Amino acid sequence: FPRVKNWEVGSITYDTLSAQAQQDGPCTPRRCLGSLVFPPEQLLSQARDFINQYYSSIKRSGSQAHEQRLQEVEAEVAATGTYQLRESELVFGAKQAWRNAPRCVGRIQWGKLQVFDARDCRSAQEMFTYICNHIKYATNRGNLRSAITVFPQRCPGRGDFRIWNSQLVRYAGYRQQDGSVRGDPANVEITELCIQHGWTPGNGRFDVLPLLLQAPDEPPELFLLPPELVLEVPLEHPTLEWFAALGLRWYALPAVSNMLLEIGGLEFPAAPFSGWYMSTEIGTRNLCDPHRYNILEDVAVCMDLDTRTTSSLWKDKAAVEINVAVLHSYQLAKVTIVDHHAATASFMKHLENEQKARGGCPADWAWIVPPISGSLTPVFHQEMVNYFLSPAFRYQPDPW
Amino acid sequence: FPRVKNWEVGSITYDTLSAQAQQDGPCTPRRCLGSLVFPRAPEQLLSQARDFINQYYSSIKRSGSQAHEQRLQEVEAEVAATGTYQLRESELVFGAKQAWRNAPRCVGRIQWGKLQVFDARDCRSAQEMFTYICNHIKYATNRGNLRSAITVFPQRCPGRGDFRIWNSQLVRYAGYRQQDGSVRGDPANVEITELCIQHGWTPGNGRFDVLPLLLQAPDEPPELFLLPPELVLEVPLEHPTLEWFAALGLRWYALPAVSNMLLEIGGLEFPAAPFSGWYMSTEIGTRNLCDPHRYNILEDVAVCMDLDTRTTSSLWKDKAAVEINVAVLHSYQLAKVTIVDHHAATASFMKHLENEQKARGGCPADWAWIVPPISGSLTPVFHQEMVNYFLSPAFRYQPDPW
Numbered sequence: 058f059p060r061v062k063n064w065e066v067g068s069i070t071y072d073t074l075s076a077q078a079q080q081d082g083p084c085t086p087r088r089c090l091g092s093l094v095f096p097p098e099q100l101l102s103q104a105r106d107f108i109n110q111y112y113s114s115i116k117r118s119g120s121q122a123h124e125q126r127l128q129e130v131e132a133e134v135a136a137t138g139t140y141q142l143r144e145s146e147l148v149f150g151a152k153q154a155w156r157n158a159p160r161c162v163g164r165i166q167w168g169k170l171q172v173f174d175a176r177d178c179r180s181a182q183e184m185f186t187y188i189c190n191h192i193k194y195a196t197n198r199g200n201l202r203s204a205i206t207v208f209p210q211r212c213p214g215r216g217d218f219r220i221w222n223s224q225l226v227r228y229a230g231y232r233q234q235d236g237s238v239r240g241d242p243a244n245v246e247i248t249e250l251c252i253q254h255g256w257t258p259g260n261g262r263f264d265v266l267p268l269l270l271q272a273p274d275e276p277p278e279l280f281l282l283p284p285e286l287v288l289e290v291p292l293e294h295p296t297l298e299w300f301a302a303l304g305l306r307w308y309a310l311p312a313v314s315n316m317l318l319e320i321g322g323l324e325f326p327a328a329p330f331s332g333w334y335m336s337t338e339i340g341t342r343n344l345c346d347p348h349r350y351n352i353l354e355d356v357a358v359c360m361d362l363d364t365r366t367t368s369s370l371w372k373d374k375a376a377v378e379i380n381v382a383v384l385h386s387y388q389l390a391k392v393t394i395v396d397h398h399a400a401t402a403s404f405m406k407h408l409e410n411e412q413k414a415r416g417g418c419p420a421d422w423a424w425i426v427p428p429i430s431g432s433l434t435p436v437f438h439q440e441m442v443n444y445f446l447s448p449a450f451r452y453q454p455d456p457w
Numbered sequence: 458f459p460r461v462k463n464w465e466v467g468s469i470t471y472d473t474l475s476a477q478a479q480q481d482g483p484c485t486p487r488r489c490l491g492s493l494v495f496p497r498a499p500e501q502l503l504s505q506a507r508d509f510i511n512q513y514y515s516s517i518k519r520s521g522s523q524a525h526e527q528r529l530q531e532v533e534a535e536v537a538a539t540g541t542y543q544l545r546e547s548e549l550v551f552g553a554k555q556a557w558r559n560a561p562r563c564v565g566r567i568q569w570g571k572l573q574v575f576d577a578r579d580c581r582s583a584q585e586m587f588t589y590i591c592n593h594i595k596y597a598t599n600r601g602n603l604r605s606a607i608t609v610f611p612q613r614c615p616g617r618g619d620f621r622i623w624n625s626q627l628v629r630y631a632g633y634r635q636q637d638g639s640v641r642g643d644p645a646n647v648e649i650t651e652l653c654i655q656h657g658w659t660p661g662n663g664r665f666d667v668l669p670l671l672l673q674a675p676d677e678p679p680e681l682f683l684l685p686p687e688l689v690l691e692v693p694l695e696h697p698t699l700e701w702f703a704a705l706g707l708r709w710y711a712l713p714a715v716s717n718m719l720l721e722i723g724g725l726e727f728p729a730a731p732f733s734g735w736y737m738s739t740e741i742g743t744r745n746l747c748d749p750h751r752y753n754i755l756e757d758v759a760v761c762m763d764l765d766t767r768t769t770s771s772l773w774k775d776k777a778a779v780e781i782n783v784a785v786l787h788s789y790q791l792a793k794v795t796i797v798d799h800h801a802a803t804a805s806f807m808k809h810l811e812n813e814q815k816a817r818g819g820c821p822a823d824w825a826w827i828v829p830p831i832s833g834s835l836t837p838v839f840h841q842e843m844v845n846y847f848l849s850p851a852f853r854y855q856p857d858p859w
């Protein structure tokens with residue numbers, strides 16, 4: 058059992074939960090690959106195990122309802138070749154997949170999740186309405202609420218439900234007479250898919266993209282989001298009056314719409330989950346990555362910093378203020394957001410909860426440690442262990 | 458072979474060098490332990506020696522030659538006879554440079570070929586050991602124009618104990634347990650401070666008292682040796698625009714010289730082989746001065762900066778840390794002592810990975826040690842995927858000799 062040390066306090070724990078690890082990771086005794094971003098009747102094996110998880114989690118192992126439910130999943134697969142989850146189970150498995158997400162620093166919140174059941178969905182126009190209930194419920198006028206919407210589970214012979222966008226809110230990315238990009242350069246591909254399928258492109262650096270929703274065995278269909286439903290935050294700084302002039306904005310709702318939910322052997326290729334932002338996500342990665350909006354030098358010029366030498370730490374100073382601007386703006390607009398110090402301190406509380414409850418916690422060090430001020434947060438000094446537990450959110454290929 | 462992506466540019470390479478990794482790390486396909494700090498007969502000696510000799514003869518464009526098999530047979534005959542063997546001088550220089558080259562947690566490896574190797578394998582006593590060390594400190598410091606160097610003391614051998622330096626670095630500040638429960642000085646150094654005292658050192662009571670050296674000759678208790686103050690170059694810390702900063706009374710020393718690691722070359726072990734380069738400013742500014750379990754100055758600086766420390770979202774911790782790093786860079790520059798900031802160091806490490814991809818087909822790197830502890834994603838290494846594995850020659854950790 059791996060020994061795990063915290064170097065700030067000098068405290069030691071053992072990760073016994075690592076024993077239950079399901080799907081193998083990318084590392085071998087020969088080499089570590091932890092820093093890499095992207096690393097038939099077996100369906101009954103995983104279903105049986107997930108069902109035992111549910112009943113132990115409600116102190117109902119070895120009793121009547123536990124025995125009972127085991128047989129009907131057995132009979133469901135025998136007759137149909139698959140099975141349906143009870144409502145309580147789909148709830149319990151959504152929370153568990155979030156709980157088991159090693160790259161998420163916000164799992165202290167994993168027990169507070171609103172689960173929308175879109176398993177009776179049957180058309181792309183139905184998708185849009187379900188997605189639209191989600192967005193408006195999750196946004197909640199800025200008092201954000203964690204939510205996931207689960208569309209039908211995949212089956213043989215029939216196509217997949219899929220959202221083609223990586224998130225529900227993305228900004229446009231436009232090429233030019235010189236190749237380079239206006240807007241968000243991450244979303245250059247989906248932007249050109251949307252232009253293909255009928256959307257007339259805007260001219261701005263912060264155009265909210267239209268959705269591309271895919272009913273099974275039908276091609277994707279464009280859907281224009283209601284602008285009154287996409288809450289956005291214009292960015293200003295508390296004491297740098299010119300910051301507002303830079304015209305920067307970000308949206309309120311972080312909602313990943315490209316990952317595949319897996320519960321008890323069942324696979325849901327369309328299942329958007331949403332929470333609220335950690336401020337480094339917007340202020341550090343989205344606005345300052347060189348391949349993203351890359352605003353770092355523009356802000357430094359406006360601050361009259363000396364950009365001619367790296368040792369003035371002008372990059373560091375300008376980055377800190379961009380993060381100050383994100384936090385101040387979201388708080389003034391009363392949109393839920395959490396800074397990387399508060400977020401990481403709650404994660405340390407989570408680890409300790411999880412140590413007592415489950416005997417460990419799969420955590421991915423490179424992604425839990427924030428991208429500014431790493432060693433100023435407690436997670437930097439906490440050793441972690443990474444492994445795969447089910448249920449889980451999984452990456453998946455793109456549907457083109 | 459593992460595919461490696463650079464997410465900032467789009468570059469894609471394949472680490473073929475990892476296939477040669479001969480010793481095992483701590484990860485399995487079940488679980489990654491990459492974030493853990495400490496993740497750890499004649500024929501086996503023979504097979505590592507054979508491999509190193511092959512490495513050396515590759516480096517001198519004499520692979521498969523007369524001289525090459527000459528050395529291979531020679532080493533076996535010496536192992537059969539003596540149970541071990543001796544490196545030629547040129548083999549030792551090449552082996553010390555490869556060990557640096559091979560060190561996955563060093564971001565300054567663009568410099569790996571520029572290393573001054575001092576051969577002290579004739580050292581006879583703790584007293585002679587001390588003399589060799591003073592000369593190392595003197596040459597490396599070079600009045601502030603620092604030069605990378607390593608001194609190699611006699612190798613491990615059956616029949617006689619090891620040479621050991623008990624201090625983890627040649628220059629360390631004392632850490633005295635206080636009256637209440639606090640530490641005065643550097644809390645990382647309470648243990649070695651206590652060993653020096655119990656070995657008859659007279660402790661000071663400052664926050665920056667330089668520690669004496671505890672030097673162990675084979676089958677001998679360690680002996681205390683004081684470093685002459687004029688040999689230990691230090692830097693008073695000031696801030697270019699925060700004049701009150703000088704009143705903190707903070708200093709750091711010029712020379713980073715690790716003295717507690719084991720140098721392995723072709724199966725032979727040198728448990729005493731201190732090595733030194735020059736600092737990257739974050740080791741001092743961020744870790745040494747701002748870690749809660751170290752000098753822990755972050756809040757005091759932020760209060761002095763008139764920041765609002767009652768709420769995290771004002772980012773007072775980030776702002777104060779940035780200026781503490783400014784103070785470090787400015788102060789070493791003022792004093793004309795070599796130092797590299799985390800933006801320049803990571804950008805030269807990017808050129809090292811490129812150089813190494815063409816020379817060897819990859820490069821062992823520990824992402825969590827390479828990415829700086831402030832402003833991580835503002836440096837290019839954050840966006841570089843990396844493959845961590847173990848090559849030999851190597852610097853390895855080893856247990857404390859007490």
Ligand code: HEM
Pocket residue numbers: 151155158160161162163164166170203204205316330331332333334335338395400424450
């Ligand atoms: C409630 C507040 C939440 C916060 C502050 C938060 C924070 C974060 C952050 C900062 C990341 C790093 C992702 C990146 O760097 O792009 C992340 C990853 C992730 N989070 Fe959370 N999260 C929250 C809620 C949730 C919820 C509700 C779910 C699912 C139900 C979830 C599941 C995940 C997953 C699967 C990842 C991995 C993303 C990927 O690998 O691309 N999180 N989270």
Ligand code: HEM
Pocket residue numbers: 553557560562563564565566568572605606607715732733734735736737740797802826852
């Ligand atoms: C010349 C300038 C150098 C720079 C800028 C530099 C930079 C660094 C830094 C920042 C670390 C991380 C240390 C920590 O966080 O405690 C490190 C580690 C290391 N360096 Fe370098 N270094 C230099 C020279 C050298 C030399 C000359 C050698 C050996 C001949 C060396 C071998 C190592 C080793 C073995 C480690 C790992 C130490 C440990 O794991 O505790 N370095 N280096």
Ligand SMILES: C[C@H](O)[C@H](O)[C@H]1CNc2nc(N)[nH]c(=O)c2N1
Pocket residue numbers: 091092093094423424425464839840841842843
């Ligand atoms: C190469 C490296 O794995 C990659 O840049 C990772 C590092 N850590 C990260 N951590 C988070 N939270 N999000 C990321 O996108 C990344 N990127």
Ligand SMILES: C[C@H](O)[C@H](O)[C@H]1CNc2nc(N)[nH]c(=O)c2N1
Pocket residue numbers: 064437438439440441492493494825826827
């Ligand atoms: C727990 C964690 O592995 C530990 O704090 C590591 C993180 N990365 C590091 N990186 C460097 N360069 N030096 C360190 O001491 C550490 N410490």
Ligand SMILES: Cc1cc(N)nc(CCCN(C)C)c1
Pocket residue numbers: 311312313330331332333334335338
């Ligand atoms: C649920 C959730 C919350 C949050 N704060 N962040 C995310 C991920 C954002 C997308 N990244 C992959 C770019 C998801």
Ligand SMILES: Cc1cc(N)nc(CCCN(C)C)c1
Pocket residue numbers: 565626713714715732733734735736737740
């Ligand atoms: C040779 C060398 C250069 C450098 N820049 N830094 C170090 C590390 C100092 C000690 N750390 C292990 C705490 C060593």
Ligand SMILES: [Cl-]
Pocket residue numbers: 311338343
């Ligand atoms: Cl995002």
Ligand SMILES: [Cl-]
Pocket residue numbers: 713740745
């Ligand atoms: Cl140090």
Ligand SMILES: [Gd]
Pocket residue numbers: none
């Ligand atoms: Gd101006």
Ligand SMILES: [Gd]
Pocket residue numbers: 698699700
């Ligand atoms: Gd001033």
Ligand SMILES: [Gd]
Pocket residue numbers: none
């Ligand atoms: Gd004071």
Ligand SMILES: [Zn+2]
Pocket residue numbers: 084088089090091484488489490491
């Ligand atoms: Zn690993």
